[PDB]
Amino acid sequence: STGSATTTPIDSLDDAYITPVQIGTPAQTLNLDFDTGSSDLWVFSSETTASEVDGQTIYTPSKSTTAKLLSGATWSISYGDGSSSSGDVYTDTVSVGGLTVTGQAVESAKKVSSSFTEDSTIDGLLGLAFSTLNTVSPTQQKTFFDNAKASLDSPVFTADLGYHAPGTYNFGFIDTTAYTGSITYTAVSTKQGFWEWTSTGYAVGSGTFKSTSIDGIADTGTTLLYLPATVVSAYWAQVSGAKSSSSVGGYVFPCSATLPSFTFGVGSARIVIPGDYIDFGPISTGSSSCFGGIQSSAGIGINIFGDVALKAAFVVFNGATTPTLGFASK
């Protein structure tokens, strides 16, 4: 089997991407944030505190003939950005782009933090990291991909995120028409539950590539590219007027600037992030100062190849017995 679903930016800056997911019988379609940096599938629901719901589409398990309550199970998650959610647990039929999983854990939110409430476009998250990070208690549950794996033609999914445009999540096959050149594969560590790999280095604009190991995670659920302070400083030093602002909370630059590209290494291959991908717009409405899309990971504890980086590539998440990551230009 295979699945193929279009993923769409939630706003003009590609702050996140949403993908329609069918849940239950008859289908209830919710727009979820596919997150390769977490491992819970959770949704706004008929159980979410009413005052914490504002515009989202909710899952109503009592209207699904295939919903089953996982007795006594609970879940509770906290994300990098400090947002959180928690609730109880159902299993139900979940389909993504034609690919159906029966008995998928669907984590129903009783409570969500404000940043979730305040984002009317995201109805929940679908985690695609390793199931060892799943927060369901007392018994951890499997991700959509884990559950689907054995049925897929190939044990893979791919992310093809668009710059200011829709893209695609495929399950079970590699669309050889979706990238240029070849896919370069690189080793993954699952020791922290993430799609963790080691980049071979970077270049800033037309500068010569610096060979240096950068351990980090491929994370579709993080907007920006977060890298070591050395790397990030070298980048913004090439942008006139750029500086790190503690009050704004990162590197900012004049909105009139032409940003250089940023290159990261995948083995002996290279992925070039165009300068325009690194512009995340005015720091506030009407400001002539703009917020950078490459920021320091210092204080996070891990480097994160988020959307800014991933949308420059066609990315293979290879869930074979020994998992790997593949990157191609496109």
Tab-separated table of C-alpha atoms in Angstrom:
chain	number	residue	atom	x	y	z
A	1	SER	CA	0.000	0.000	0.000
A	2	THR	CA	0.887	3.679	-0.344
A	3	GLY	CA	-0.501	7.085	0.569
A	4	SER	CA	-0.022	10.567	-0.840
A	5	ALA	CA	-1.290	13.787	0.713
A	6	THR	CA	-0.809	17.463	-0.039
A	7	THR	CA	0.521	19.600	2.793
A	8	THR	CA	-0.212	23.344	2.810
A	9	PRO	CA	1.407	26.283	4.600
A	10	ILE	CA	-0.825	27.748	7.318
A	11	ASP	CA	0.181	31.314	6.520
A	12	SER	CA	2.233	33.545	4.245
A	13	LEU	CA	5.498	32.794	6.082
A	14	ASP	CA	5.352	28.974	6.090
A	15	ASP	CA	5.173	29.051	9.908
A	16	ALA	CA	3.810	25.492	9.681
A	17	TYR	CA	2.158	23.084	7.249
A	18	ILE	CA	-1.182	21.281	7.507
A	19	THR	CA	-2.225	18.006	5.944
A	20	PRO	CA	-5.793	16.666	5.849
A	21	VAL	CA	-6.292	13.467	7.822
A	22	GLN	CA	-9.454	11.347	7.877
A	23	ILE	CA	-10.366	10.079	11.352
A	24	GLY	CA	-13.193	7.714	12.247
A	25	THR	CA	-16.275	6.281	10.573
A	26	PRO	CA	-17.797	8.174	8.815
A	27	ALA	CA	-14.614	10.148	8.173
A	28	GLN	CA	-14.033	13.304	10.176
A	29	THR	CA	-11.402	15.277	8.303
A	30	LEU	CA	-8.987	17.278	10.453
A	31	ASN	CA	-6.015	19.318	9.312
A	32	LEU	CA	-2.965	18.140	11.226
A	33	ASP	CA	0.614	19.311	11.657
A	34	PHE	CA	2.868	16.442	10.573
A	35	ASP	CA	5.764	16.576	12.997
A	36	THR	CA	8.857	14.383	12.492
A	37	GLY	CA	10.131	15.704	15.837
A	38	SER	CA	7.399	14.161	18.058
A	39	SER	CA	5.474	10.899	18.249
A	40	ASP	CA	1.948	11.654	19.372
A	41	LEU	CA	-1.124	11.940	17.148
A	42	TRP	CA	-3.413	14.261	19.105
A	43	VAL	CA	-6.456	16.266	18.116
A	44	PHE	CA	-8.794	18.970	19.269
A	45	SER	CA	-11.956	17.115	20.217
A	46	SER	CA	-15.391	17.179	21.773
A	47	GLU	CA	-13.548	16.700	25.065
A	48	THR	CA	-11.288	19.772	24.786
A	49	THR	CA	-12.147	22.444	27.350
A	50	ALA	CA	-14.595	24.651	25.492
A	51	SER	CA	-12.830	27.924	26.411
A	52	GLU	CA	-9.630	26.520	24.896
A	53	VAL	CA	-11.196	25.910	21.458
A	54	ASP	CA	-11.339	28.793	18.943
A	55	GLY	CA	-12.050	27.926	15.326
A	56	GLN	CA	-10.410	24.518	15.179
A	57	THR	CA	-12.209	21.526	13.724
A	58	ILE	CA	-12.776	18.957	16.439
A	59	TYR	CA	-12.856	15.166	16.504
A	60	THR	CA	-16.001	13.781	18.096
A	61	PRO	CA	-15.384	10.130	19.017
A	62	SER	CA	-19.016	9.497	19.968
A	63	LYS	CA	-19.928	10.064	16.298
A	64	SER	CA	-17.417	7.454	15.061
A	65	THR	CA	-18.543	3.823	14.875
A	66	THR	CA	-14.942	2.641	14.964
A	67	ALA	CA	-13.716	4.735	17.921
A	68	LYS	CA	-12.692	2.812	21.015
A	69	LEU	CA	-11.666	4.319	24.340
A	70	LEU	CA	-8.329	3.044	25.592
A	71	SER	CA	-9.371	2.408	29.181
A	72	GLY	CA	-7.454	4.405	31.776
A	73	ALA	CA	-4.951	5.754	29.274
A	74	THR	CA	-3.762	9.327	29.417
A	75	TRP	CA	-1.230	11.468	27.594
A	76	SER	CA	0.597	14.735	28.259
A	77	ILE	CA	3.171	16.430	26.064
A	78	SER	CA	5.367	19.526	26.221
A	79	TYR	CA	7.040	20.952	23.133
A	80	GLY	CA	10.239	22.873	22.469
A	81	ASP	CA	8.350	26.150	22.125
A	82	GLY	CA	6.862	25.611	25.573
A	83	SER	CA	3.419	24.766	24.258
A	84	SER	CA	1.604	21.782	25.692
A	85	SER	CA	-1.483	19.590	25.575
A	86	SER	CA	-2.964	16.599	27.385
A	87	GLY	CA	-5.944	14.277	27.519
A	88	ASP	CA	-7.229	10.725	27.123
A	89	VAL	CA	-6.845	8.202	24.327
A	90	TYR	CA	-8.964	6.555	21.660
A	91	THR	CA	-8.096	4.200	18.866
A	92	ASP	CA	-9.810	4.752	15.553
A	93	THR	CA	-9.350	4.329	11.819
A	94	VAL	CA	-6.981	6.953	10.429
A	95	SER	CA	-6.325	7.561	6.755
A	96	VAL	CA	-3.737	9.811	5.156
A	97	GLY	CA	-3.826	10.344	1.387
A	98	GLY	CA	-5.481	6.979	0.725
A	99	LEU	CA	-3.407	5.005	3.245
A	100	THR	CA	-5.497	3.505	6.051
A	101	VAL	CA	-4.407	2.406	9.500
A	102	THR	CA	-6.917	0.655	11.705
A	103	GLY	CA	-6.611	0.934	15.489
A	104	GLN	CA	-4.460	4.055	15.458
A	105	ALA	CA	-4.054	5.779	18.815
A	106	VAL	CA	-5.829	9.110	18.525
A	107	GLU	CA	-5.014	11.220	21.496
A	108	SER	CA	-7.981	13.396	22.427
A	109	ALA	CA	-7.077	16.739	24.032
A	110	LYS	CA	-8.810	17.698	27.272
A	111	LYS	CA	-6.454	20.681	27.643
A	112	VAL	CA	-4.271	22.645	25.230
A	113	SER	CA	-1.996	25.639	25.906
A	114	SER	CA	-2.750	29.075	24.543
A	115	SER	CA	-0.519	28.910	21.471
A	116	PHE	CA	-2.655	26.013	20.203
A	117	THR	CA	-5.947	27.724	20.992
A	118	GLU	CA	-4.691	30.829	19.266
A	119	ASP	CA	-3.900	28.933	16.042
A	120	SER	CA	-7.239	28.228	14.368
A	121	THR	CA	-5.624	26.509	11.388
A	122	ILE	CA	-4.097	23.540	13.227
A	123	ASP	CA	-6.544	20.861	14.442
A	124	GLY	CA	-3.836	18.708	16.007
A	125	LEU	CA	-0.481	17.024	15.453
A	126	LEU	CA	0.552	13.781	13.794
A	127	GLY	CA	3.927	12.686	15.123
A	128	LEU	CA	6.389	10.968	12.857
A	129	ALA	CA	9.394	10.558	15.117
A	130	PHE	CA	10.134	7.212	16.741
A	131	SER	CA	7.476	5.642	18.890
A	132	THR	CA	9.787	5.621	21.905
A	133	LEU	CA	8.881	9.314	22.395
A	134	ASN	CA	5.129	8.623	22.543
A	135	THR	CA	3.704	10.016	25.787
A	136	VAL	CA	0.726	7.708	26.302
A	137	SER	CA	0.604	6.107	29.729
A	138	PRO	CA	0.583	3.465	31.081
A	139	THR	CA	1.382	1.858	27.736
A	140	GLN	CA	3.125	3.800	24.988
A	141	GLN	CA	1.436	3.795	21.602
A	142	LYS	CA	2.775	3.581	18.051
A	143	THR	CA	2.940	6.348	15.473
A	144	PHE	CA	0.885	6.337	12.288
A	145	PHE	CA	4.037	5.465	10.321
A	146	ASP	CA	5.034	2.648	12.677
A	147	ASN	CA	1.556	1.140	12.429
A	148	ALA	CA	1.489	1.500	8.638
A	149	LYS	CA	5.072	0.287	8.023
A	150	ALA	CA	4.504	-3.422	7.445
A	151	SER	CA	1.736	-2.705	4.926
A	152	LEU	CA	3.692	-0.133	2.921
A	153	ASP	CA	5.318	-1.165	-0.367
A	154	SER	CA	8.529	0.264	1.109
A	155	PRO	CA	9.066	1.236	4.777
A	156	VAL	CA	9.512	4.954	4.052
A	157	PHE	CA	7.821	8.271	4.039
A	158	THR	CA	8.958	11.388	2.237
A	159	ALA	CA	8.602	15.113	2.931
A	160	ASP	CA	8.487	17.558	0.061
A	161	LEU	CA	7.655	20.891	1.692
A	162	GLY	CA	6.965	23.923	-0.505
A	163	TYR	CA	8.382	27.414	-0.229
A	164	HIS	CA	5.296	29.678	-0.040
A	165	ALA	CA	3.379	26.870	-1.742
A	166	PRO	CA	1.894	23.433	-1.131
A	167	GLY	CA	3.990	20.284	-1.050
A	168	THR	CA	3.616	16.563	-0.439
A	169	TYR	CA	3.910	13.807	2.158
A	170	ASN	CA	4.179	10.373	0.557
A	171	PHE	CA	4.039	7.043	2.369
A	172	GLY	CA	5.450	3.805	1.048
A	173	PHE	CA	7.205	4.967	-2.122
A	174	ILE	CA	9.776	7.397	-3.529
A	175	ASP	CA	8.455	9.696	-6.247
A	176	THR	CA	11.466	9.761	-8.558
A	177	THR	CA	9.934	12.706	-10.452
A	178	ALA	CA	9.925	14.960	-7.360
A	179	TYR	CA	13.646	15.744	-7.117
A	180	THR	CA	16.651	16.559	-9.276
A	181	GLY	CA	19.824	14.512	-9.329
A	182	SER	CA	20.276	11.727	-6.844
A	183	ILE	CA	19.218	11.118	-3.281
A	184	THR	CA	22.123	10.981	-0.851
A	185	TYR	CA	21.474	8.837	2.211
A	186	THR	CA	23.060	9.370	5.600
A	187	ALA	CA	23.028	7.524	8.957
A	188	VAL	CA	20.422	8.052	11.650
A	189	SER	CA	20.684	7.681	15.406
A	190	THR	CA	17.440	6.808	17.177
A	191	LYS	CA	18.999	6.982	20.664
A	192	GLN	CA	17.031	10.158	21.496
A	193	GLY	CA	13.875	9.134	19.590
A	194	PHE	CA	14.511	11.602	16.756
A	195	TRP	CA	15.521	11.459	13.100
A	196	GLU	CA	18.996	12.489	14.250
A	197	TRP	CA	21.844	12.652	11.760
A	198	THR	CA	25.172	14.415	11.207
A	199	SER	CA	25.544	17.080	8.570
A	200	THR	CA	29.008	17.272	7.034
A	201	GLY	CA	29.257	21.084	7.087
A	202	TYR	CA	28.014	24.373	5.704
A	203	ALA	CA	28.626	27.256	3.373
A	204	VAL	CA	27.380	30.857	3.503
A	205	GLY	CA	26.319	32.226	0.128
A	206	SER	CA	29.091	31.755	-2.388
A	207	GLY	CA	31.679	31.021	0.309
A	208	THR	CA	33.717	27.846	0.308
A	209	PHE	CA	32.098	24.974	2.154
A	210	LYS	CA	33.454	24.311	5.619
A	211	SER	CA	33.776	20.662	6.458
A	212	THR	CA	32.585	20.159	10.044
A	213	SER	CA	30.250	17.730	11.793
A	214	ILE	CA	26.877	19.091	12.870
A	215	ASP	CA	24.649	16.669	14.758
A	216	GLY	CA	20.971	17.592	14.440
A	217	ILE	CA	17.424	16.411	13.834
A	218	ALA	CA	15.176	16.536	10.760
A	219	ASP	CA	12.065	18.206	12.225
A	220	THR	CA	9.098	19.158	10.060
A	221	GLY	CA	7.339	20.518	13.144
A	222	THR	CA	9.932	23.266	13.738
A	223	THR	CA	9.702	26.368	11.548
A	224	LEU	CA	13.262	27.551	11.515
A	225	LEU	CA	16.829	26.290	11.103
A	226	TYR	CA	18.652	26.169	14.454
A	227	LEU	CA	22.387	25.637	14.359
A	228	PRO	CA	25.435	26.234	16.537
A	229	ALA	CA	26.222	29.845	17.447
A	230	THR	CA	29.465	29.773	15.472
A	231	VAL	CA	27.700	28.755	12.264
A	232	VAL	CA	24.855	31.197	12.767
A	233	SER	CA	27.238	34.078	13.487
A	234	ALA	CA	29.192	33.334	10.306
A	235	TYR	CA	25.932	33.500	8.369
A	236	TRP	CA	24.560	36.789	9.665
A	237	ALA	CA	27.998	38.451	9.483
A	238	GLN	CA	27.429	38.419	5.727
A	239	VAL	CA	24.184	40.439	6.015
A	240	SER	CA	24.629	44.174	6.331
A	241	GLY	CA	22.853	45.568	9.385
A	242	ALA	CA	22.072	42.154	10.857
A	243	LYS	CA	22.415	41.725	14.594
A	244	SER	CA	21.190	39.474	17.387
A	245	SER	CA	18.439	41.106	19.435
A	246	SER	CA	17.735	39.682	22.884
A	247	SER	CA	14.536	41.693	23.076
A	248	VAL	CA	13.274	40.308	19.764
A	249	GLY	CA	14.731	36.913	20.603
A	250	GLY	CA	17.157	36.279	17.773
A	251	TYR	CA	18.860	37.579	14.661
A	252	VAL	CA	17.104	40.384	12.825
A	253	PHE	CA	18.097	42.232	9.657
A	254	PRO	CA	16.927	45.127	7.516
A	255	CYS	CA	13.905	43.985	5.506
A	256	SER	CA	15.499	45.594	2.415
A	257	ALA	CA	18.553	43.297	2.593
A	258	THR	CA	19.362	40.643	0.022
A	259	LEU	CA	20.042	37.494	2.018
A	260	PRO	CA	22.759	35.051	1.001
A	261	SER	CA	21.936	31.389	0.537
A	262	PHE	CA	22.917	28.818	3.161
A	263	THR	CA	24.300	25.404	2.229
A	264	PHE	CA	24.338	22.326	4.446
A	265	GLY	CA	26.143	19.072	3.700
A	266	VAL	CA	24.678	15.587	3.395
A	267	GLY	CA	27.654	13.319	2.998
A	268	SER	CA	29.491	14.608	-0.048
A	269	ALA	CA	26.249	16.181	-1.348
A	270	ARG	CA	24.986	19.711	-0.703
A	271	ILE	CA	21.537	21.256	-0.167
A	272	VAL	CA	21.308	24.978	-0.929
A	273	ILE	CA	18.742	27.030	0.974
A	274	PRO	CA	18.007	30.141	-1.065
A	275	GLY	CA	18.344	33.476	0.742
A	276	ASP	CA	14.628	34.207	0.334
A	277	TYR	CA	13.766	31.132	2.412
A	278	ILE	CA	15.578	32.721	5.337
A	279	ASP	CA	13.379	35.865	5.430
A	280	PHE	CA	10.565	35.565	7.980
A	281	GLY	CA	9.238	39.023	7.569
A	282	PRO	CA	8.764	42.088	9.785
A	283	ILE	CA	9.334	41.492	13.504
A	284	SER	CA	6.028	43.307	13.982
A	285	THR	CA	3.447	44.689	11.601
A	286	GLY	CA	4.912	47.640	9.716
A	287	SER	CA	8.482	47.294	10.970
A	288	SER	CA	11.392	47.615	8.606
A	289	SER	CA	13.320	45.073	10.744
A	290	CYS	CA	12.885	41.449	9.707
A	291	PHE	CA	13.333	38.195	11.604
A	292	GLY	CA	15.891	35.674	10.394
A	293	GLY	CA	15.107	32.056	9.590
A	294	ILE	CA	18.503	30.771	10.725
A	295	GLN	CA	18.929	31.073	14.488
A	296	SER	CA	21.209	29.792	17.240
A	297	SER	CA	20.462	26.427	18.855
A	298	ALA	CA	22.424	27.471	21.947
A	299	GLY	CA	20.066	26.880	24.825
A	300	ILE	CA	17.938	24.325	22.975
A	301	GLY	CA	20.373	21.474	23.576
A	302	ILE	CA	20.055	20.166	20.040
A	303	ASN	CA	20.477	21.423	16.490
A	304	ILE	CA	17.259	21.430	14.441
A	305	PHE	CA	16.956	21.167	10.693
A	306	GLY	CA	13.441	22.576	10.587
A	307	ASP	CA	11.238	23.653	7.718
A	308	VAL	CA	13.595	26.354	6.477
A	309	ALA	CA	16.124	23.617	5.698
A	310	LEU	CA	13.816	20.743	4.818
A	311	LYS	CA	11.754	22.728	2.284
A	312	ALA	CA	14.940	23.184	0.235
A	313	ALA	CA	15.064	19.406	-0.238
A	314	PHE	CA	13.210	16.235	-1.031
A	315	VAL	CA	13.615	14.245	2.182
A	316	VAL	CA	13.365	10.499	2.632
A	317	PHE	CA	12.610	9.143	6.076
A	318	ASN	CA	13.668	5.551	5.710
A	319	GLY	CA	12.168	3.427	8.464
A	320	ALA	CA	13.920	0.213	7.491
A	321	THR	CA	15.412	-1.950	10.247
A	322	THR	CA	18.391	0.350	10.220
A	323	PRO	CA	16.804	3.764	9.622
A	324	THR	CA	18.432	6.382	7.392
A	325	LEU	CA	17.649	9.831	5.973
A	326	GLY	CA	17.854	10.751	2.334
A	327	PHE	CA	18.220	14.238	0.862
A	328	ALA	CA	17.973	15.446	-2.718
A	329	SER	CA	17.801	18.847	-4.331
A	330	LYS	CA	14.597	19.681	-6.162
